[model samples]
Target: GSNFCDSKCKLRCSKAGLADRCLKYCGICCEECKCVPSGTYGNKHECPCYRDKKNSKGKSKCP
Candidate 1:
């Protein structure tokens, strides 16, 4: 199908659109990616966040 929620089905996360390399071709989508907090003050950096934001209405949920 043209719609899927797997890593290979979508692009990487945006991380609020302020993150570098946010567009990871690693296929990390919403709720599926991992968000790692690091860097100075622990708020200066962010890791991959696995979130299922690309859910298809009532058809997508954590597995």
Candidate 2:
């Protein structure tokens, strides 16, 4: 749900240079994956769904 996304991505993207863009994609990932890494960065191993999502181009899609 968006509720989990709002809070999770808010915290996840809090340190981003382009915060709005980070929040946008991060929230999208959160909704689909139902999880976000614990802090602002670098904990992808903790949430495999969020960690593994890929774009059409096949690079990682999550923030």
Candidate 3:
């Protein structure tokens, strides 16, 4: 819907671990969801998009 979390999500995910991996999916979720929780994990509930995202296999995809 919006790209409000583009840079912020990139930065947060980058700082958490490998920049490459973080940006890959985080970019997708954040851009569509417009929200990125702090830390590397355990905060999926904070962002509905992150918490609700599902892969082709019907499993949670965002990290």
Candidate 4:
């Protein structure tokens, strides 16, 4: 399941600007949500779990 999720996160996090942190967080959220949205950029609406992963200060967590 993680490999599958990892693959999904790859395409979704493809364009990340630094640290591959995008993949790290995507992997984090994928396991919790068991799903990852498409697109390398903000497609947050596809997976509401990703959308719901907000910081306490309201900045995006999964995005």
The residue pairs in collision within model 3 are none
Clashing residue pairs, backbone N/CA/C < 3 A, model 2: none
| TM-score versus the correct structure, for each prediction | 0.16, 0.93, 0.69, 0.81
Better of 3 and 4 by TM-score: 4
Q: How accurate is candidate 3 locally (lDDT)?
A: 0.72
Residue 59 miss distance in model 2 (angstroms): 0.8
Evaluated with lDDT, which candidate comes out highest?
A: 2
Task: State in Å the error of residue 4, model 3.
Answer: 4.1
lDDT of 2 by residue, 1-63 (tens): 478889889899888999988898898898888899998989999999989999899989899
- C-alpha local distance difference test of each model: 0.32, 0.90, 0.72, 0.82
- Weakest 10 consecutive residues of candidate 3 by summed lDDT: 1-10
Cα error, residue 8 of model 2, in Å, equals: 0.7
What tens digits encode model 3's per-residue C-alpha lDDT throughout 3-54? 5566666556765556776677777777777777777677777888888998
Best by TM-score: 2
lDDT of 4: 0.82
Q: How far is candidate 4 from the true structure (C-alpha RMSD, Å)?
A: 1.8
- Count backbone clashes in candidate 1: 13
The TM-score of candidate 1 is: 0.16
User: Which tens-of-lDDT digit does each residue in 1-51 have in candidate 1?
Assistant: 123433322333333343333433223432245432332122312432432
Instruction: State the weakest 10-residue window (summed lDDT) of model 2.
Output: 1-10
Q: Candidate 1: worst 10 consecutive residues by lDDT?
A: 36-45
